[PDB]
CSV table of C-alpha atoms and ligand atoms in Angstrom, one decimal:
chain,number,residue,atom,x,y,z
B,62,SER,CA,88.5,87.1,79.8
B,63,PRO,CA,87.9,86.7,83.6
B,64,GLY,CA,91.2,84.6,83.7
B,65,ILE,CA,93.6,86.7,81.7
B,66,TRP,CA,96.5,88.4,83.3
B,67,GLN,CA,99.5,90.3,81.9
B,68,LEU,CA,103.0,90.4,83.5
B,69,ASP,CA,104.8,93.8,83.6
B,70,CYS,CA,108.3,94.6,84.9
B,71,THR,CA,109.4,98.1,85.8
B,72,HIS,CA,112.4,99.6,87.6
B,73,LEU,CA,112.9,102.0,90.5
B,74,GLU,CA,115.8,102.8,92.9
B,75,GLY,CA,117.9,100.2,91.1
B,76,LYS,CA,115.4,97.5,91.9
B,77,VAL,CA,112.7,95.7,90.0
B,78,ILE,CA,109.0,95.9,90.5
B,79,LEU,CA,107.2,92.9,89.0
B,80,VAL,CA,103.5,93.5,88.4
B,81,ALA,CA,100.6,91.3,87.3
B,82,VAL,CA,97.7,93.1,85.8
B,83,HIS,CA,94.2,91.6,85.5
B,84,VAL,CA,93.5,92.8,82.0
B,85,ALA,CA,89.7,93.2,82.2
B,86,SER,CA,89.6,95.1,85.5
B,87,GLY,CA,93.0,96.9,85.8
B,88,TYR,CA,93.5,95.3,89.2
B,89,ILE,CA,97.1,94.6,90.1
B,90,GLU,CA,99.4,92.6,92.4
B,91,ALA,CA,103.1,93.6,92.6
B,92,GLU,CA,106.3,92.8,94.4
B,93,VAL,CA,109.9,94.2,94.6
B,94,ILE,CA,112.7,91.8,93.6
B,95,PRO,CA,116.5,92.4,93.3
B,96,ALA,CA,116.4,91.3,89.6
B,97,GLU,CA,114.0,89.7,87.3
B,98,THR,CA,114.9,86.0,87.1
B,99,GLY,CA,112.9,82.9,86.0
B,100,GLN,CA,112.8,81.7,89.7
B,101,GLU,CA,111.4,85.0,91.0
B,102,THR,CA,108.9,85.2,88.1
B,103,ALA,CA,107.8,81.5,88.7
B,104,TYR,CA,107.3,82.1,92.4
B,105,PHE,CA,105.3,85.3,91.8
B,106,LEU,CA,103.0,83.4,89.5
B,107,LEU,CA,102.6,80.6,91.9
B,108,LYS,CA,101.5,83.1,94.6
B,109,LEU,CA,99.1,84.9,92.2
B,110,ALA,CA,97.4,81.7,91.0
B,111,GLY,CA,96.8,80.4,94.6
B,112,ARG,CA,94.9,83.7,95.1
B,113,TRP,CA,92.9,84.3,91.8
B,114,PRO,CA,91.6,81.9,89.1
B,115,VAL,CA,94.5,82.6,86.7
B,116,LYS,CA,93.8,80.9,83.4
B,117,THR,CA,96.2,82.7,81.0
B,118,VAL,CA,99.3,84.8,81.6
B,119,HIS,CA,100.8,87.0,78.9
B,120,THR,CA,104.5,87.0,79.9
B,121,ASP,CA,106.4,90.3,79.9
B,122,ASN,CA,109.4,89.4,77.7
B,123,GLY,CA,110.9,86.5,75.8
B,124,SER,CA,113.2,85.4,78.6
B,125,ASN,CA,110.3,84.7,81.0
B,126,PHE,CA,108.4,83.1,78.0
B,127,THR,CA,111.4,80.8,77.4
B,128,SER,CA,112.3,80.1,81.0
B,129,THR,CA,111.9,76.5,81.9
B,130,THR,CA,111.3,77.5,85.6
B,131,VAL,CA,108.5,79.8,84.5
B,132,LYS,CA,107.0,77.1,82.3
B,133,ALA,CA,107.2,74.6,85.3
B,134,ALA,CA,105.3,77.0,87.5
B,135,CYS,CA,102.7,77.6,84.9
B,136,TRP,CA,102.3,73.8,84.5
B,137,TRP,CA,102.1,73.4,88.3
B,138,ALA,CA,99.4,76.0,88.7
B,139,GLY,CA,97.3,75.2,85.6
B,140,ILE,CA,98.2,78.4,83.8
B,141,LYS,CA,98.4,78.8,80.0
B,142,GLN,CA,101.7,80.7,79.4
B,143,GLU,CA,101.4,83.0,76.4
B,144,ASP,CA,103.6,85.6,74.8
B,145,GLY,CA,103.0,89.3,75.4
B,146,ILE,CA,103.1,90.4,71.8
B,147,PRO,CA,100.7,93.4,71.6
B,148,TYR,CA,98.7,92.5,68.5
B,149,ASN,CA,96.6,95.3,69.8
B,150,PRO,CA,98.9,98.4,69.7
B,151,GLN,CA,96.8,100.0,72.5
B,152,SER,CA,98.3,97.5,75.0
B,153,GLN,CA,101.8,98.9,75.1
B,154,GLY,CA,100.2,102.3,76.0
B,155,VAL,CA,98.0,101.0,78.7
B,156,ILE,CA,101.0,99.3,80.4
B,157,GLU,CA,103.3,102.4,80.1
B,158,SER,CA,100.4,104.6,81.5
B,159,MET,CA,100.1,102.1,84.3
B,160,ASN,CA,103.8,102.1,85.1
B,161,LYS,CA,103.8,106.0,85.1
B,162,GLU,CA,100.7,106.1,87.5
B,163,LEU,CA,102.2,103.5,89.8
B,164,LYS,CA,105.5,105.4,90.0
B,165,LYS,CA,103.5,108.6,90.7
B,166,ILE,CA,101.7,106.9,93.6
B,167,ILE,CA,105.0,105.5,94.9
B,168,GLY,CA,106.5,109.0,94.9
B,169,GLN,CA,103.4,110.3,96.8
B,170,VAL,CA,103.9,107.7,99.6
B,171,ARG,CA,107.7,107.4,99.4
B,172,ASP,CA,108.4,109.2,102.7
B,173,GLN,CA,106.0,106.9,104.6
B,174,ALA,CA,108.2,103.9,104.5
B,175,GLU,CA,111.9,103.2,104.7
B,176,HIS,CA,111.8,100.2,102.3
B,177,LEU,CA,110.7,100.4,98.7
B,178,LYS,CA,108.6,97.2,99.1
B,179,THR,CA,106.4,99.0,101.7
B,180,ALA,CA,105.8,102.0,99.3
B,181,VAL,CA,105.0,99.6,96.5
B,182,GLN,CA,102.3,97.8,98.6
B,183,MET,CA,100.9,101.2,99.6
B,184,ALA,CA,100.7,102.0,95.8
B,185,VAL,CA,99.0,98.7,95.0
B,186,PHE,CA,96.4,99.5,97.7
B,187,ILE,CA,95.7,103.0,96.4
B,188,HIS,CA,95.6,101.8,92.8
B,189,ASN,CA,93.1,98.9,93.5
B,190,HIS,CA,90.8,101.1,95.7
B,191,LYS,CA,90.8,104.1,93.4
B,192,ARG,CA,87.2,104.8,92.3
B,193,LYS,CA,87.1,105.3,88.5
B,194,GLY,CA,82.1,104.4,89.4
B,195,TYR,CA,83.8,101.3,90.6
B,196,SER,CA,87.4,100.5,91.8
B,197,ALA,CA,89.6,97.9,90.1
B,198,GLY,CA,89.2,95.7,93.2
B,199,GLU,CA,85.4,95.9,92.8
B,200,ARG,CA,85.6,95.2,89.1
B,201,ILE,CA,87.7,92.0,89.4
B,202,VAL,CA,85.4,90.5,92.0
B,203,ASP,CA,82.3,91.3,89.9
B,204,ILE,CA,83.9,89.9,86.7
B,205,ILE,CA,84.9,86.6,88.4
B,206,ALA,CA,81.7,86.2,90.4
B,207,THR,CA,79.7,86.7,87.2
B,208,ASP,CA,81.9,84.0,85.6
B,209,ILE,CA,81.3,81.5,88.5
B,210,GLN,CA,77.5,81.9,88.2
J,1137,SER,CA,81.3,89.6,107.7
J,1138,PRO,CA,82.5,89.8,104.1
J,1139,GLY,CA,85.3,92.0,105.5
J,1140,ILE,CA,86.4,89.9,108.5
J,1141,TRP,CA,89.8,88.1,108.6
J,1142,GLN,CA,91.6,86.2,111.3
J,1143,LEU,CA,95.4,86.0,111.7
J,1144,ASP,CA,97.0,82.7,112.5
J,1145,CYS,CA,100.7,81.9,113.2
J,1146,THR,CA,102.0,78.4,112.9
J,1147,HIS,CA,105.6,76.9,112.9
J,1148,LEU,CA,107.4,74.4,110.7
J,1149,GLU,CA,111.1,73.6,109.9
J,1150,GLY,CA,112.1,76.2,112.5
J,1151,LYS,CA,110.3,78.9,110.6
J,1152,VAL,CA,107.0,80.8,111.0
J,1153,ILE,CA,104.1,80.6,108.6
J,1154,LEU,CA,101.8,83.7,109.0
J,1155,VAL,CA,98.3,83.0,107.7
J,1156,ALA,CA,95.2,85.2,107.2
J,1157,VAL,CA,91.9,83.4,107.0
J,1158,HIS,CA,88.8,85.0,105.5
J,1159,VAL,CA,86.4,83.7,108.1
J,1160,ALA,CA,83.2,83.4,106.1
J,1161,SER,CA,84.8,81.5,103.2
J,1162,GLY,CA,87.9,79.7,104.6
J,1163,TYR,CA,90.0,81.3,101.9
J,1164,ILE,CA,93.6,81.9,102.9
J,1165,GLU,CA,96.8,83.9,102.1
J,1166,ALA,CA,100.1,82.9,103.8
J,1167,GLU,CA,103.8,83.7,103.9
J,1168,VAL,CA,106.9,82.2,105.5
J,1169,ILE,CA,108.9,84.7,107.8
J,1170,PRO,CA,111.9,84.0,110.0
J,1171,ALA,CA,110.0,85.1,113.1
J,1172,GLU,CA,106.8,86.8,113.9
J,1173,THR,CA,107.6,90.5,114.6
J,1174,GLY,CA,105.3,93.6,114.5
J,1175,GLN,CA,107.0,94.8,111.3
J,1176,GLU,CA,106.5,91.4,109.5
J,1177,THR,CA,102.8,91.3,110.6
J,1178,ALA,CA,102.2,95.0,109.6
J,1179,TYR,CA,103.7,94.4,106.1
J,1180,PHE,CA,101.6,91.2,105.6
J,1181,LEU,CA,98.4,93.1,106.5
J,1182,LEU,CA,99.3,95.9,104.1
J,1183,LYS,CA,99.7,93.4,101.3
J,1184,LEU,CA,96.4,91.6,102.2
J,1185,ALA,CA,94.4,94.8,102.4
J,1186,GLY,CA,95.6,96.1,99.0
J,1187,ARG,CA,94.3,92.8,97.5
J,1188,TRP,CA,90.9,92.2,99.3
J,1189,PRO,CA,88.4,94.6,101.1
J,1190,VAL,CA,89.7,93.9,104.6
J,1191,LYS,CA,87.4,95.6,107.2
J,1192,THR,CA,88.3,93.8,110.4
J,1193,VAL,CA,91.3,91.7,111.5
J,1194,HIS,CA,91.3,89.5,114.5
J,1195,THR,CA,95.0,89.5,115.5
J,1196,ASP,CA,96.6,86.1,116.4
J,1197,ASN,CA,98.0,87.1,119.8
J,1198,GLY,CA,98.4,89.9,122.3
J,1199,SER,CA,101.8,91.1,121.1
J,1200,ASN,CA,100.5,91.8,117.5
J,1201,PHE,CA,97.4,93.3,119.1
J,1202,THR,CA,99.6,95.7,121.2
J,1203,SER,CA,102.3,96.3,118.5
J,1204,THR,CA,102.4,100.0,117.5
J,1205,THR,CA,103.6,99.0,114.0
J,1206,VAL,CA,100.7,96.6,113.5
J,1207,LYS,CA,98.3,99.5,114.7
J,1208,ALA,CA,100.0,101.8,112.3
J,1209,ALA,CA,99.5,99.4,109.3
J,1210,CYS,CA,95.8,98.9,110.4
J,1211,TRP,CA,95.4,102.7,110.5
J,1212,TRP,CA,97.1,103.1,107.1
J,1213,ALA,CA,94.9,100.5,105.4
J,1214,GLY,CA,91.6,101.3,107.0
J,1215,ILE,CA,91.5,98.1,109.1
J,1216,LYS,CA,89.7,97.8,112.4
J,1217,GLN,CA,92.2,95.9,114.6
J,1218,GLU,CA,90.5,93.5,117.0
J,1219,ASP,CA,91.6,90.9,119.6
J,1220,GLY,CA,91.2,87.3,118.7
J,1221,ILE,CA,89.5,85.9,121.8
J,1222,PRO,CA,87.4,82.9,120.9
J,1223,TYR,CA,84.3,84.1,122.7
J,1224,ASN,CA,83.1,81.4,120.4
J,1225,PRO,CA,84.9,78.2,121.5
J,1226,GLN,CA,84.5,76.6,118.1
J,1227,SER,CA,87.1,79.1,116.7
J,1228,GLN,CA,90.1,77.5,118.4
J,1229,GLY,CA,89.2,74.2,116.8
J,1230,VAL,CA,88.6,75.5,113.3
J,1231,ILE,CA,92.0,77.2,113.3
J,1232,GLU,CA,93.8,74.2,114.8
J,1233,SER,CA,92.2,72.0,112.1
J,1234,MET,CA,93.3,74.4,109.4
J,1235,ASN,CA,96.9,74.4,110.7
J,1236,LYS,CA,96.9,70.6,110.6
J,1237,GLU,CA,95.3,70.5,107.1
J,1238,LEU,CA,97.8,73.0,105.8
J,1239,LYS,CA,100.8,71.1,107.3
J,1240,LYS,CA,99.5,67.9,105.7
J,1241,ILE,CA,99.3,69.6,102.3
J,1242,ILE,CA,102.8,71.0,102.8
J,1243,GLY,CA,104.0,67.4,103.5
J,1244,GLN,CA,102.3,66.2,100.3
J,1245,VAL,CA,104.2,68.8,98.2
J,1246,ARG,CA,107.4,69.2,100.2
J,1247,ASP,CA,109.7,67.3,97.8
J,1248,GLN,CA,108.5,69.5,94.8
J,1249,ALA,CA,110.4,72.5,96.1
J,1250,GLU,CA,113.8,73.3,97.8
J,1251,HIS,CA,112.4,76.3,99.8
J,1252,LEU,CA,109.7,76.0,102.4
J,1253,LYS,CA,108.0,79.2,101.0
J,1254,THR,CA,107.4,77.4,97.7
J,1255,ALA,CA,105.7,74.5,99.4
J,1256,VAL,CA,103.6,76.9,101.5
J,1257,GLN,CA,102.4,78.7,98.2
J,1258,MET,CA,101.6,75.3,96.7
J,1259,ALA,CA,99.6,74.5,99.8
J,1260,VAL,CA,97.7,77.8,99.7
J,1261,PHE,CA,96.9,77.0,96.0
J,1262,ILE,CA,95.6,73.5,96.8
J,1263,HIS,CA,93.6,74.7,99.8
J,1264,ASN,CA,91.8,77.6,98.1
J,1265,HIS,CA,91.0,75.5,95.1
J,1266,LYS,CA,89.7,72.4,96.9
J,1267,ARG,CA,85.9,71.9,96.3
J,1268,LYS,CA,84.0,70.9,99.4
J,1269,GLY,CA,80.4,72.0,96.0
J,1270,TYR,CA,82.4,75.3,95.9
J,1271,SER,CA,86.0,76.1,96.6
J,1272,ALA,CA,87.1,78.7,99.2
J,1273,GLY,CA,88.3,80.9,96.3
J,1274,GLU,CA,84.8,80.7,94.8
J,1275,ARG,CA,83.1,81.4,98.1
J,1276,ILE,CA,85.2,84.5,98.9
J,1277,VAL,CA,84.5,86.1,95.4
J,1278,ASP,CA,80.7,85.3,95.8
J,1279,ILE,CA,80.5,86.7,99.3
J,1280,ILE,CA,82.3,90.0,98.4
J,1281,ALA,CA,80.5,90.4,95.0
J,1282,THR,CA,77.1,90.0,96.8
J,1283,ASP,CA,78.2,92.7,99.3
J,1284,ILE,CA,79.3,95.2,96.5
J,1285,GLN,CA,75.8,94.6,95.0
Y,2342,N44,C1,109.3,100.7,112.7
Y,2342,N44,C2,108.7,100.3,111.6
Y,2342,N44,C3,109.3,100.4,110.2
Y,2342,N44,N1,108.7,101.5,109.4
Y,2342,N44,C4,108.7,102.8,110.1
Y,2342,N44,C5,108.8,104.0,109.2
Y,2342,N44,C6,110.0,104.3,108.6
Y,2342,N44,C7,110.1,105.4,107.8
Y,2342,N44,C8,109.0,106.1,107.5
Y,2342,N44,C9,107.8,105.8,108.0
Y,2342,N44,C10,107.6,104.7,108.9
Y,2342,N44,C11,106.3,104.4,109.4
Y,2342,N44,O1,106.2,104.1,110.6
Y,2342,N44,N2,105.2,104.4,108.5
Y,2342,N44,C12,103.9,104.1,108.9
Y,2342,N44,C13,103.5,102.7,108.5
Y,2342,N44,C14,103.9,101.6,109.2
Y,2342,N44,C15,103.6,100.3,108.8
Y,2342,N44,C16,102.8,100.1,107.7
Y,2342,N44,C17,102.4,101.2,106.9
Y,2342,N44,C18,102.8,102.5,107.4
Y,2342,N44,C19,107.5,101.1,108.6
Y,2342,N44,C20,107.6,99.7,108.1
Y,2342,N44,C21,106.8,98.7,108.7
Y,2342,N44,C22,106.8,97.4,108.3
Y,2342,N44,C23,107.6,97.1,107.3
Y,2342,N44,C24,108.4,98.0,106.6
Y,2342,N44,C25,108.4,99.3,107.0
Y,2342,N44,C26,109.3,100.4,106.3
Y,2342,N44,O2,109.7,101.4,107.0
Y,2342,N44,O3,109.5,100.2,105.1
Y,2342,N44,O4,109.2,97.5,105.6
Y,2342,N44,C27,108.8,96.1,105.7
Y,2342,N44,O5,107.8,95.8,106.7
Y,2343,N44,C1,115.1,76.0,89.4
Y,2343,N44,C2,114.1,76.4,90.3
Y,2343,N44,C3,114.3,76.0,91.8
Y,2343,N44,N1,113.3,74.9,92.2
Y,2343,N44,C4,113.7,73.6,91.6
Y,2343,N44,C5,113.2,72.5,92.4
Y,2343,N44,C6,114.1,72.1,93.5
Y,2343,N44,C7,113.7,71.0,94.3
Y,2343,N44,C8,112.6,70.3,94.0
Y,2343,N44,C9,111.8,70.6,92.9
Y,2343,N44,C10,112.1,71.7,92.1
Y,2343,N44,C11,111.2,72.1,91.0
Y,2343,N44,O1,111.7,72.4,89.9
Y,2343,N44,N2,109.8,72.0,91.2
Y,2343,N44,C12,108.9,72.4,90.1
Y,2343,N44,C13,108.4,73.7,90.3
Y,2343,N44,C14,109.1,74.8,89.9
Y,2343,N44,C15,108.6,76.1,90.0
Y,2343,N44,C16,107.3,76.3,90.6
Y,2343,N44,C17,106.6,75.2,91.0
Y,2343,N44,C18,107.1,73.9,90.8
Y,2343,N44,C19,111.9,75.4,92.2
Y,2343,N44,C20,111.7,76.8,92.7
Y,2343,N44,C21,111.3,77.7,91.7
Y,2343,N44,C22,111.2,79.0,92.1
Y,2343,N44,C23,111.4,79.4,93.4
Y,2343,N44,C24,111.7,78.4,94.3
Y,2343,N44,C25,111.9,77.1,94.0
Y,2343,N44,C26,112.2,76.1,95.1
Y,2343,N44,O2,112.9,75.1,94.8
Y,2343,N44,O3,111.8,76.3,96.2
Y,2343,N44,O4,111.8,79.0,95.6
Y,2343,N44,C27,111.5,80.4,95.3
Y,2343,N44,O5,111.2,80.6,93.9
């Protein structure tokens, strides 16, 4: 549970926003890329796993699941690459809700940056600090610290 | 001190590696950029602060300290922007040592990636996971969790 992340890909302004969600906390990391490729996805996971103890990744689609570059990054970083089949139906909904919330925040900050990537990082900030009470940033640290002890 | 980070800029292969060190743990995040500008430094800090509770940043040089874009990002993200003067002489040495260790790791992984940015993320991964016994990634989580509690 402390080590499980889910990949999520959403679109805006003709660009792609790749998101990793820490399932147990709702904490996120995201980046803007021109298109979702195996190489972009691989690099994103390598970044993520150098930063948090990533044990398992539920990939966002079958192409990233199949991708030999994505499998190579997961091998490199010690990550168990799994499919993203929502055996729990509530998962599709949580992710769609998350994409809608993130797009809302992006629109609230959109005029504060020329580039979409800036707005996306502002939205990540607001999302992770939003007190729900604890924030997602607080919850991820507590979950992992509890795990280490 | 759970919220204090130090910026560090180093060079390799005619490119710039921008590093943020979490002082109390030695945990790092880094990126490759073509040149250190205020815009690049501002964007990097915005990413960092959406991911960890960044309270204070010791800037790496006077230009980033002066930079109005860097000040604007620190304002946006709630970061107290400070100078980086090593009033403590041991700070120079610690950072110099980290740069040499990071470059060493980059050399050990260099052939496993075409692009320097890939090698740099591999190096961040090895650095944050190295047990010295706890790893820097373990120490940062514990420091911040204790703080939240
Ligand atoms: C001259 C700086 C460039 N602009 C100015 C701007 C243009 C249009 C609207 C507002 C602003 C503004 O000053 N917002 C406050 C602010 C500044 C920095 C960080 C957070 C908030 C911000 C910026 C900086 C670094 C970046 C960027 C961008 C970006 O515009 O996307 O993209 C990659 O790294
Ligand atoms: C087909 C992918 C391209 N290469 C292949 C390669 C070229 C030269 C030497 C080795 C390799 C190799 O397969 N290493 C294993 C490996 C693959 C992925 C992640 C970690 C380790 C890796 C790569 C992937 C994504 C990226 C990259 C790069 C990069 O080469 O820098 O840069 C930004 O996103």
